[PDB]
Amino acid sequence: SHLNLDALREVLECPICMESFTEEQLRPKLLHCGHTICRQCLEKLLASGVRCPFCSKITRITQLTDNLTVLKIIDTAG
Amino acid sequence: SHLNLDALREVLECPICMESFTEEQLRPKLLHCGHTICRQCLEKLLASSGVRCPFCSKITRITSLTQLTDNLTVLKIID
Ligand SMILES: [Zn+2]
Ligand SMILES: [Zn+2]
Ligand SMILES: [Zn+2]
Ligand SMILES: [Zn+2]
């Protein structure tokens, strides 16, 4: 099966702070709109729900689901 | 950045029917629990409908697949 190499790099780092996702600090969080931002960038919007900056839908108030696809890919437990 | 190759293969195919995700037929759909199943397998579980995830027993309440979010990460990868 094919795969896009440039797109694979984009999805592994937060589109805001441009740092690569981690399991704890920059944990990839799934907004209800489907876009993914890290936990730290998500904390900035926690000062008040949360409005996604790419599509203008808002995510309600952390019981947010993790981006399980990203976490499995960057898993290096072995 | 590093990445798990075997895990990268797992996430690019439906964990139920073992078919690789596509953009239309086997479109990867995001359940509310965070797990992803293809568009075709989801119709089978919506035929018996909410939708029950077969890996974690959480339920997703939908009446049409257009209400479920796509897995934007998978779709970007296979674009
Ligand atoms: Zn970030
Ligand atoms: Zn969004
Ligand atoms: Zn399937
Ligand atoms: Zn589940």
Numbering used by the authors:
A (entry chain A): 7 to 54, 58 to 70, 74 to 90
B (entry chain B): 7 to 55, 58 to 87
Sentences from the paper on this structure:
TRIM E3 ubiquitin ligases regulate a wide variety of cellular processes and are particularly important during innate immune signalling events. They are characterized by a conserved tripartite motif in their N‐terminal portion which comprises a canonical RING domain, one or two B‐box domains and a coiled‐coil region that mediates ligase dimerization. The RING domain of TRIMs adopts the canonical RING domain fold that recognizes the ubiquitin‐loaded E2 conjugating enzyme (E2~Ub). To understand the role of self‐association and gain insight into the mechanism of TRIM‐mediated ubiquitination, we have analysed the properties of two TRIM ligases, TRIM25 and TRIM32, which differ in their domain architecture with TRIM25 containing two B‐boxes compared to a single B‐box2 in TRIM32.
In contrast, a fragment that is extended by 10 and 9 residues N‐ and C‐terminally, which are predicted to be α‐helical, is dimeric at all concentrations tested, suggesting that TRIM32 might dimerize in a manner similar to that of a number of homo‐ and heterodimeric RING ligases such as the BRCA1/BARD1 complex, where N‐ and C‐terminally located α‐helices form a four‐helix bundle (Brzovic et al, 2001). The extended RING domain of TRIM32 crystallized as a dimer with a significant proportion of the dimer interface formed by two α‐helices located N‐ and C‐terminal to the core RING domain, respectively, that form a four‐helix bundle. Dimerization buries 970 A2 and the dimer interface is formed predominantly by hydrophobic residues located within the four helices. RING dimerization through a four‐helix bundle employing regions outside the RING has been observed in a number of dimeric RINGs such as the BRCA1/BARD1 heterodimer or the Rad18 homodimer (Brzovic et al, 2001; Huang et al, 2011). The RINGs of TRIM32 are constitutive dimers even in the absence of the rest of the remainder of the protein or additional binding partners. In contrast, we could not detect activity for the monomeric TRIM32 core RING domain. However, the extended dimeric RING showed a similar level of activity as the B‐box‐containing fragment, which was further enhanced in the tetrameric TRIM32 RBCC construct albeit to a much lower extend compared to TRIM25. In support of a more general role of this acidic residue, mutation of the equivalent E16 in TRIM32 also disrupts catalytic activity. This effect is similar to the mutation of I85R, which interferes with dimerization, similar to V72R in TRIM25 (and EV2).
